[PDB]
């Protein structure tokens, strides 16, 4: 569903710029979906990514044609990074509050094994730093000077 929303948002922000394109209701939902995860389990981000990959493989097998296969091979690398990337597409519309709302999840998803999720989190965190440098600086200072070796590493 998040993927579908992503394409909707991309169409709307790539055609109305050539209001609907100034406010979007679902963004908040995306933010929650990104924060509604366990970064320490039954709902750990690793398990969610594995489930997404399994679903992708199953769907590929089902459509095992050129159209869907190519789309999944180019536009949907994995399902798990769908919400974050969505927020990337609608970055200009995001208010300064939702940047700080999404910052923790982007920070926590930076070490994901999946390359796509890592890249999406990196992009989101960089944009957050661009828009709200103070929060990013405070978080970085707290993290580097942390009393736990694991955290610093």
Question: Alpha helix locations (H) across 91-148?
Answer: 96-108, 115-131, 133-144
> Considering only CA atoms, which of 54, 108, 59 is closest in space to residue 80?
54
Resolution (A): 3.1
Class of residue 31 by CB neighbours under 10 A (exposed 0-12, middle 13-18, buried 19+): buried
Query: Cα torsion at 111, 115, 120, 125 (round to 10°)?
Result: 30
23 DSSP assignment: -
What distance in Å separates the CA atoms of residue 101 and residue 106, rounded to the nearest whole number? 10
Question: Which residues does 43 contact at the CB level (< 8 Å), separation at least 6?
Answer: 36, 37
Query: Cα torsion at 130, 131, 132, 133 (round to 10°)?
Result: 20
């Amino acid at each position: 569903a998040c993927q579908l929303l992503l394409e909707i948002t991309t169409f709307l922000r790539e055609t109305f710029s050539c209001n609907y394109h100034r406010n979007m209701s679902w963004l908040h939902v995306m933010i929650l979906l990104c924060n509604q995860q366990s970064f320490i389990h039954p709902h750990c981000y690793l398990h969610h990514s594995r489930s997404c990959a399994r679903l992708v493989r199953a769907i590929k097998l089902l459509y095992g044609d050129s159209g869907m296969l190519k789309y999944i091979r180019l536009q949907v690398m994995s399902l798990s990074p769908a919400p974050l990337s969505l927020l990337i597409k609608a970055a200009p519309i995001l208010t300064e509050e939702m940047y700080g709302d999404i910052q923790p999840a982007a920070w926590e998803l930076l070490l994901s094994m999946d390359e796509h999720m890592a890249g999406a989190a990196a992009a989101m965190f960089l944009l957050c730093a661009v828009k709200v440098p103070e929060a990013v600086s405070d978080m970085l200072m707290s993290e580097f000077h942390h009393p736990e070796t694991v955290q610093r590493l």
